[PDB]
Write a protein that binds this ligand. Sequence first.
Ligand SMILES: [Mg+2]
Ligand SMILES: [Mg+2]
Ligand SMILES: [Mg+2]
Ligand SMILES: [Mg+2]
Ligand SMILES: [Mg+2]
Ligand SMILES: [Mg+2]
Ligand SMILES: [Mg+2]
Ligand SMILES: [Mg+2]
Ligand SMILES: [Mg+2]
Ligand SMILES: [Mg+2]
Ligand SMILES: [Mg+2]
Ligand SMILES: [Mg+2]
Ligand SMILES: [Mg+2]
Ligand SMILES: [Mg+2]
Ligand SMILES: [Mg+2]
Ligand SMILES: [Mg+2]
Ligand SMILES: [Mg+2]
Ligand SMILES: [Mg+2]
Ligand SMILES: [Mg+2]
Ligand SMILES: [Mg+2]
Ligand SMILES: [Mg+2]
Ligand SMILES: [Mg+2]
Ligand SMILES: [Mg+2]
Ligand SMILES: [Mg+2]
Ligand SMILES: [Mg+2]
Ligand SMILES: [Mg+2]
Ligand SMILES: [Mg+2]
Ligand SMILES: [Mg+2]
Ligand SMILES: [Mg+2]
Ligand SMILES: [Mg+2]
Ligand SMILES: [Mg+2]
Ligand SMILES: [Mg+2]
Ligand SMILES: [Mg+2]
Ligand SMILES: [Mg+2]
Ligand SMILES: [Mg+2]
Ligand SMILES: [Mg+2]
Ligand SMILES: [Mg+2]
Ligand SMILES: [Mg+2]
Ligand SMILES: [Mg+2]
Ligand SMILES: [Mg+2]
Ligand SMILES: [Mg+2]
Ligand SMILES: [Mg+2]
Ligand SMILES: [Mg+2]
Ligand SMILES: [Mg+2]
Ligand SMILES: [Mg+2]
Ligand SMILES: [Mg+2]
Ligand SMILES: [Mg+2]
Ligand SMILES: [Mg+2]
Ligand SMILES: [Mg+2]
Ligand SMILES: [Mg+2]
Ligand SMILES: [Mg+2]
Ligand SMILES: [Mg+2]
Ligand SMILES: [Mg+2]
Ligand SMILES: [Mg+2]
Ligand SMILES: [Mg+2]
Ligand SMILES: [Mg+2]
Ligand SMILES: [Mg+2]
Ligand SMILES: [Mg+2]
Ligand SMILES: [Mg+2]
Ligand SMILES: [Mg+2]
Ligand SMILES: [Mg+2]
Ligand SMILES: [Mg+2]
Ligand SMILES: [Mg+2]
Ligand SMILES: [Mg+2]
Ligand SMILES: [Mg+2]
Ligand SMILES: [Mg+2]
Ligand SMILES: [Mg+2]
Ligand SMILES: [Mg+2]
Ligand SMILES: [Mg+2]
Ligand SMILES: [Mg+2]
Ligand SMILES: [Mg+2]
Ligand SMILES: [Mg+2]
Ligand SMILES: [Mg+2]
Ligand SMILES: [Mg+2]
Ligand SMILES: [Mg+2]
Ligand SMILES: [Mg+2]
Ligand SMILES: [Mg+2]
Ligand SMILES: [Mg+2]
Ligand SMILES: [Mg+2]
Lengths: 260, 205, 127
Amino acid sequence: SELAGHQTSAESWGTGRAVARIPRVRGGGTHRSGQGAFGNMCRGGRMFAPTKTWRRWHRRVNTTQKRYAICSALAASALPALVMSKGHRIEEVPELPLVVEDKVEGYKKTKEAVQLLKKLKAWNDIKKVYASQRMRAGKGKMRNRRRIQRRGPCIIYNEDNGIIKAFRNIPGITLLNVSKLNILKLAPGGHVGRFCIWTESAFRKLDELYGTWRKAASLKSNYNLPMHKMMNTDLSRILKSPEIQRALRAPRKKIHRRVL
Amino acid sequence: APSRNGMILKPHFHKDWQQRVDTWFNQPARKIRRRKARQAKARRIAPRPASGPIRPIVRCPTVRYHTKVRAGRGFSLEELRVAGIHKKVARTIGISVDPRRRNKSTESLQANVQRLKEYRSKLILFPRKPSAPKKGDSSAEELKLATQLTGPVMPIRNVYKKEKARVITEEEKNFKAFASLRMARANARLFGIRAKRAKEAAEQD
Amino acid sequence: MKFNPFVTSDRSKNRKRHFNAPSHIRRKIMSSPLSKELRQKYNVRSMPIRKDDEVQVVRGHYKGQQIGKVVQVYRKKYVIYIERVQREKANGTTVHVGIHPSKVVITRLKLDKDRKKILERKAKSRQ
RNA sequence: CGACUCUUAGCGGUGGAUCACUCGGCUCGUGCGUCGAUGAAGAACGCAGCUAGCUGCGAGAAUUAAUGUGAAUUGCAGGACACAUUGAUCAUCGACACUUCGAACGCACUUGCGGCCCCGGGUUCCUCCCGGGGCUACGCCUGUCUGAGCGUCGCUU
RNA sequence: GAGCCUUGAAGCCUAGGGCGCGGGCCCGGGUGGAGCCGCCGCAGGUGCAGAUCUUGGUGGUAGUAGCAAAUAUUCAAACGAGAACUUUGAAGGCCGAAGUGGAGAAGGGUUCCAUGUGAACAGCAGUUGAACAUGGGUCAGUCGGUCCUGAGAGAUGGGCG
RNA sequence: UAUAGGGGCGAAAGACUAAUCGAACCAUCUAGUAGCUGGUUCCCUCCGAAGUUUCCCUCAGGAUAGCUGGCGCUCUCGCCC
RNA sequence: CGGCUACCCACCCGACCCGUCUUGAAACACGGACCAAGGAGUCUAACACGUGCGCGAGUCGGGGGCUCGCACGAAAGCCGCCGUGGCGCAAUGAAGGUGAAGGCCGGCGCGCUCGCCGGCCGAGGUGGGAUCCCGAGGCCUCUCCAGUCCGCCGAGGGGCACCACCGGCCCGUCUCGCCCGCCGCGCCGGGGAGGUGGAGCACGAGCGCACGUGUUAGGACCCGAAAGAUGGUGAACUAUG
RNA sequence: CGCGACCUCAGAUCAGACGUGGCGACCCGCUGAAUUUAAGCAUAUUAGUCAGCGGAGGAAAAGAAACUAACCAGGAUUCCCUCAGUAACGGCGAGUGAACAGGGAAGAGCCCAGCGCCGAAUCCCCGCCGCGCGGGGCGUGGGAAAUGUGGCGUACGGAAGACCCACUCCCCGGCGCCGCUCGUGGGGGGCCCAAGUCCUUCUGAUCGAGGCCCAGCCCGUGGACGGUGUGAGGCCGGUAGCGGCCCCGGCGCCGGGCUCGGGUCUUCCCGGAGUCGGGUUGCUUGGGAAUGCAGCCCAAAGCGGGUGGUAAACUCCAUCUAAGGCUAAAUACCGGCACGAGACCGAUAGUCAACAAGUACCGUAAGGGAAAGUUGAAAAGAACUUUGAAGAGAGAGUUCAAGAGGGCGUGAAACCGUUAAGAGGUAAACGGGUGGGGUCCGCGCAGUCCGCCCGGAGGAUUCAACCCGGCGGCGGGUCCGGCCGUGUCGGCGGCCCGGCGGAUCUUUCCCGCCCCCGGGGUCGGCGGGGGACCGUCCCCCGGACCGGCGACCGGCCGCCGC
Ligand SMILES: [Mg+2]
Ligand SMILES: [Mg+2]
Ligand SMILES: [Mg+2]
Ligand SMILES: [Mg+2]
Ligand SMILES: [Mg+2]
Ligand SMILES: [Mg+2]
Ligand SMILES: [Mg+2]
Ligand SMILES: [Mg+2]
Ligand SMILES: [Mg+2]
Ligand SMILES: [Mg+2]
Ligand SMILES: [Mg+2]
Ligand SMILES: [Mg+2]
Ligand SMILES: [Mg+2]
Ligand SMILES: [Mg+2]
Ligand SMILES: [Mg+2]
Ligand SMILES: [Mg+2]
Ligand SMILES: [Mg+2]
Ligand SMILES: [Mg+2]
Ligand SMILES: [Mg+2]
Ligand SMILES: [Mg+2]
Ligand SMILES: [Mg+2]
Ligand SMILES: [Mg+2]
Ligand SMILES: [Mg+2]
Ligand SMILES: [Mg+2]
Ligand SMILES: [Mg+2]
Ligand SMILES: [Mg+2]
Ligand SMILES: [Mg+2]
Ligand SMILES: [Mg+2]
Ligand SMILES: [Mg+2]
Ligand SMILES: [Mg+2]
Ligand SMILES: [Mg+2]
Ligand SMILES: [Mg+2]
Ligand SMILES: [Mg+2]
Ligand SMILES: [Mg+2]
Ligand SMILES: [Mg+2]
Ligand SMILES: [Mg+2]
Ligand SMILES: [Mg+2]
Ligand SMILES: [Mg+2]
Ligand SMILES: [Mg+2]
Ligand SMILES: [Mg+2]
Ligand SMILES: [Mg+2]
Ligand SMILES: [Mg+2]
Ligand SMILES: [Mg+2]
Ligand SMILES: [Mg+2]
Ligand SMILES: [Mg+2]
Ligand SMILES: [Mg+2]
Ligand SMILES: [Mg+2]
Ligand SMILES: [Mg+2]
Ligand SMILES: [Mg+2]
Ligand SMILES: [Mg+2]
Ligand SMILES: [Mg+2]
Ligand SMILES: [Mg+2]
Ligand SMILES: [Mg+2]
Ligand SMILES: [Mg+2]
Ligand SMILES: [Mg+2]
Ligand SMILES: [Mg+2]
Ligand SMILES: [Mg+2]
Ligand SMILES: [Mg+2]
Ligand SMILES: [Mg+2]
Ligand SMILES: [Mg+2]
Ligand SMILES: [Mg+2]
Ligand SMILES: [Mg+2]
Ligand SMILES: [Mg+2]
Ligand SMILES: [Mg+2]
Ligand SMILES: [Mg+2]
Ligand SMILES: [Mg+2]
Ligand SMILES: [Mg+2]
Ligand SMILES: [Mg+2]
Ligand SMILES: [Mg+2]
Ligand SMILES: [Mg+2]
Ligand SMILES: [Mg+2]
Ligand SMILES: [Mg+2]
Ligand SMILES: [Mg+2]
Ligand SMILES: [Mg+2]
Ligand SMILES: [Mg+2]
Ligand SMILES: [Mg+2]
Ligand SMILES: [Mg+2]
Ligand SMILES: [Mg+2]
Ligand SMILES: [Mg+2]
């Protein structure tokens, strides 16, 4: 409140009145007359360095770095290892990028939505979400936050026809658009590899929204796909290739321990 | 107070500044209010376009920006007179009028009156009853569109003369030079002095 | 999920508005479900509790199939009293035990001119 | 052997720390833009069946009238229980009412002292006789009435 | 973490077992009764032995100093569980009329009276009280205010601002 | 009843002005400034001083240099010189 | 039977009571009776360096606008003829102002302390310089024959970055003299050779975001004055009418 | 002498009407310090801030140039980003510090005094007459204001008056109604989906696994709250251009009153004064030979006056018309009435105040100002017997729990009492190393180690060796019938039934302007559109490399299970 301690009018005693030198309130007939005034070490006083409202809350990020992170999350969501190591149940899923027809965006009821999620063998993750819905831990329950819900699949769509209604009641689900890709929803908690469910048009629009290494993006004016550093990211084949081992040194696997 | 090496600083925080600090925590709310106001105004004035009043062609005054052209406030009374429409009717027609602006160049006067003529030719207004003239039987099914964005008829996008390529003439090798600009500056600096010298010389005769 | 920007999800605000609710809102809060054979008859799910209607406890300590009747609706305590759901004091005198109306199911209603109107309104709104 | 003292553990007492809860704050944003001479803010007094404070009210005083809702309030007896009459509580609140001081307005405020008009009772009347009702502050605006000017003017004694 | 929990969460205690050099942590047991924690990152109003530090509580001192300004109390009885402090009677004394008397103004505001209990107040005690609870109590033409001016304060006319 | 704070009042002690008077009390500026005292909270590992030069109304201080630590970077040995 | 320990007891040895000011503390120097809770380097703006990231002579939409009304949305997505604009890409003078390419070859005019012409690549040279290239020489079953097979090196060459020097170019100055041009033949302009001053050029590296340290202005690590100003309350005590 | 009119004026409890004061977060006018910094302090900074006074509104002020610039000029005002920590100010020290551009949000412009014309065609009041719901304005007649000057017509962007020319029939104020207004206009009351079913813990259930092969049911409703704990379905509530009911405001249509614009020509008119400016003295500003304001003095002109950032004279140029006024917009809001949210606080924290808090209490007064939450799911608050006069206690009783017994959840430390153990002349305590006692822990103590292989002692089983049927996976050869990646041509083909960019072009292409003599002449130029070449992309054939994390069949070796 910026006035947590300076509501009391008080002055210090001084040399005499050997009780202390901290300012003390003036008055009488009250057991609060003569206590500690505003201060850090005093009871009922202001705190050290009162938190101001003009603190730097928001942090801006370059748009190129934002797009880099989005493409990184999209590329990580296509690898089965990275999405399996996050916690999603993809053991029965036929194809990791689940690209379905355009009929799903025209859904109006949630019964057909649950039927589609069960047919695509993605219902195990929603069942895990249902099972893990414990209560918030600590003092966060008082501040209107009493539920812990784990994140499930996110259906990325375009040209909404009522799919938000059909996917707005399933717990752990996330609704995302191709034209508005959010890192907070694609990589929750700072870890890449979230299970994704796409649509035909949502999957065909990615080549035009981000572009390839040959042609730039059509929707974004001056954006191109990020450059690729190591063309072959497999160290095993490189180290075991004959060209590398053609001019290597002897192994020399002798220990040569200490001699007494 | 100073350190080993550093830029000398003079921060303007000696005043009592903490009691007057404007934090922009209401910026999204302000943008939402402005967007809602724009939408409400456009919906109320739907047959008329957003930023309705047409704005003339305006050159920047200073020498730093006088190479580009920009929009302005209103057309001049001379431009209205060359266009042939009355001054007071242009306001209800949808033509912003600036009575304070003057016209010094016919090159801009012709451009402004041409813009006015184009706006008048593209303009289609609605009557109260079909007894009003200067209209058609059907209003192009709401004129194919109700509202326009970012300029009523056309923005102020810059155009440039091409002057693609040409053959160099004979005397172009010795036509201009840095000495030409130097002589021009010297004459501009010593113009009046030479006149006074010629005057005092003719005085002696 | 909540979508109206004019209704709150604050736990403290909800608790305050529930504990300091007026008497005409307490009667709506103190509502009890109806029996299965009566729900299909009246085409309504729940109904507020009054003084004359009979009721049957479904959950709690004094639960069973014994049909009972309410004698007091204590709106201040969000509770109702039943003549047979009682307890003995130290000296042996009887005193009613309080059970919440949400933990009790109704079997009989007083057919009043206003009760029939509420029933038909709820039925026409459920359609 | 006992008593006293010291160190540990169990239990007990003073003590009210930690933990859990929160009808409370702090911050941010949104909507509206509202006091009074037709009596504002604030203050005093009083009002409940039993009632001290907070809250809510003004001698119609823990609320009146009307509308919506529909069977109660509650600490205790009573009480309208009546609803094929008008029907409890609650909320809304546009209709009535709103004591004294307070810009406070009859003078001052020690609740005194008046002054006019009207209505009921007193010698059926004024003349410093009781009760009740209305008016009786300052400045200023428009108009009316009253009247002062060896300020200017015309006719006249 | 398809984490642990009303077959027992947090917290607290413990001559129990054990780990880490250490900050600390794990398990067993006893209370307790509704939440909590590990891992990956993020942000702090984040670690106390002191500051004649702030608040609250508790010890040695210590059952110690102290209940000593103004001559003084005693006997019998009653009401009471309880008597030195209350009541009645008697004896011995003080204030001795500039009082330890009878009335007032300021100030206090129910402290005045009757009944009733005896944990708190009365520096011991109490059947007692100016304490507590209940109920009563202030009657004016001729008592004073109200009237009048005194020193003095003060609005309008006017002036200044 | 009148005089109210750089004012009042003073048979003058700078005495009195609500337990405060060689300048009252109350609230705000104000979290006034201090080269001056006091305090400043968890573990382990590694490195580890100075009280000295010059200048300053400088001597209980600061600036500069020096002492110290961290981040590195550029090369050199590792197979008669 | 075995058991260190946060249980108690005893002996042997060593053992002064903690914190900070100080050359010197256990001090006859200061604070601490004890216990529980609270308690002190924070945040903003700016600067310097270092590190991580993205782009790159470019970089940055933080300011606005667009899509659809939204719990999560005070988020996120986009602007592309919104880059206006900030930083950097050019510096030097007080200013009028000016404002950065060298090297080889041949010729002519006195190849003159001497300018121009023509051709080429195009940011000079010296001494060091990681690395790279060439490389005599020898190192693998009986033999003249070979491409891989075993496999290092004397010497030599072009030389990253960086270091020192010389020379070169730009701007402000001082000395010396001569030449060229005319939108007008002048106290008009331009040019050279030498010495100096610049935060300069001599194939550019910055921008935006985050973190850490250091300095500084904000009350700024926390607690602490003697005092100053503004506006009000007191003559119920006391001094005086 | 009197009467009357005018003019400066007085009184009323004359008729009607208005202001006072309060809040004051935001705004406007005035003056208004010091602590601090300058390591001291006077100028300066703090600051044209705090305190003080006067006023109003949801906003106020500002606002239509006596403006900015000096070139291809722009054009009210307000707010944001840049300009810019710059120009500049300063014991030029500390420090202070704008403005014009430009891009954005919003963009609404006008009136009057004067000069002239209109028989004052103007305005207020009073009273009867013709009108409508909740009550005020239209037509009639007299009493005043006003010729020392009402009103239309007029406003520097010119205007007025008189001919000529070709035109325009409209707009503004109530009354009754149907259908809508963008979240599907605003306000208010009530209603609307889906388990409480089986089994088992628990005082209590919302705990615990499932509900046939269509996954027990709903979901546009799985946010939250209350309910004996931890609920999507038991209950208000939430989603829903969901429904029905009541109240208020506008869009189209039936009576009533006003009502000539545009251009050329001819004629006339055209302006704010103790004010600008100057001298001087203070305050202020970055404003410097003085930015602005104020006090005194001097105090004008109409080819004039102001400004052009260095004072003064001569000349030219650019811009504006000040001493009169009104106006919503984007802007601010710590007060007020309601609402929503939180990486904030969780009872020594957070506002002083979570509770009978600006309360108790303190000082005469201004003023100062606290402490203080938790029984239990439900009082179900301990009947009754006994001791004591009572406080209190022993039994008993409710609750799962009294180890929750009326400031009672949990219940630490300091301190104290009791019980048990040990010890005691160098105060206690402490580190190194042992010993003794005790609690407790693990083992059952001359009797306890595990797994593999082989040789023996007895019983029961199918498989393994091998073959056959057969599926699933691995490996490479032919890359076989096909898949795509990396490059070069090619069908010039998808250019018209394919996309982007390019200061690369095509004036012998078009459209709209323009120059010269309707038409002609490219003689030249401007904007838009069409199309030719360039660098990036879409299909088949032919081949160049990898067949690699892109994959199928045919055939083979070698595995696994059935
Ligand atoms: Mg506080
Ligand atoms: Mg403050
Ligand atoms: Mg204060
Ligand atoms: Mg916790
Ligand atoms: Mg330092
Ligand atoms: Mg809240
Ligand atoms: Mg204890
Ligand atoms: Mg009523
Ligand atoms: Mg008065
Ligand atoms: Mg009266
Ligand atoms: Mg238990
Ligand atoms: Mg509980
Ligand atoms: Mg802290
Ligand atoms: Mg402590
Ligand atoms: Mg102390
Ligand atoms: Mg306490
Ligand atoms: Mg003590
Ligand atoms: Mg004694
Ligand atoms: Mg005494
Ligand atoms: Mg007796
Ligand atoms: Mg006696
Ligand atoms: Mg005597
Ligand atoms: Mg006497
Ligand atoms: Mg006496
Ligand atoms: Mg008594
Ligand atoms: Mg006593
Ligand atoms: Mg008495
Ligand atoms: Mg009493
Ligand atoms: Mg009498
Ligand atoms: Mg008298
Ligand atoms: Mg006076
Ligand atoms: Mg006056
Ligand atoms: Mg003074
Ligand atoms: Mg005194
Ligand atoms: Mg003073
Ligand atoms: Mg401080
Ligand atoms: Mg020194
Ligand atoms: Mg060093
Ligand atoms: Mg310490
Ligand atoms: Mg010292
Ligand atoms: Mg010393
Ligand atoms: Mg020491
Ligand atoms: Mg000491
Ligand atoms: Mg001493
Ligand atoms: Mg001490
Ligand atoms: Mg602590
Ligand atoms: Mg630019
Ligand atoms: Mg201080
Ligand atoms: Mg001073
Ligand atoms: Mg004063
Ligand atoms: Mg006196
Ligand atoms: Mg100082
Ligand atoms: Mg000083
Ligand atoms: Mg300051
Ligand atoms: Mg100043
Ligand atoms: Mg102020
Ligand atoms: Mg006012
Ligand atoms: Mg108002
Ligand atoms: Mg004007
Ligand atoms: Mg800058
Ligand atoms: Mg100055
Ligand atoms: Mg400075
Ligand atoms: Mg200033
Ligand atoms: Mg619940
Ligand atoms: Mg729930
Ligand atoms: Mg329901
Ligand atoms: Mg002039
Ligand atoms: Mg002029
Ligand atoms: Mg000039
Ligand atoms: Mg000049
Ligand atoms: Mg004006
Ligand atoms: Mg004006
Ligand atoms: Mg506005
Ligand atoms: Mg926090
Ligand atoms: Mg407190
Ligand atoms: Mg008894
Ligand atoms: Mg308990
Ligand atoms: Mg307790
Ligand atoms: Mg013992």
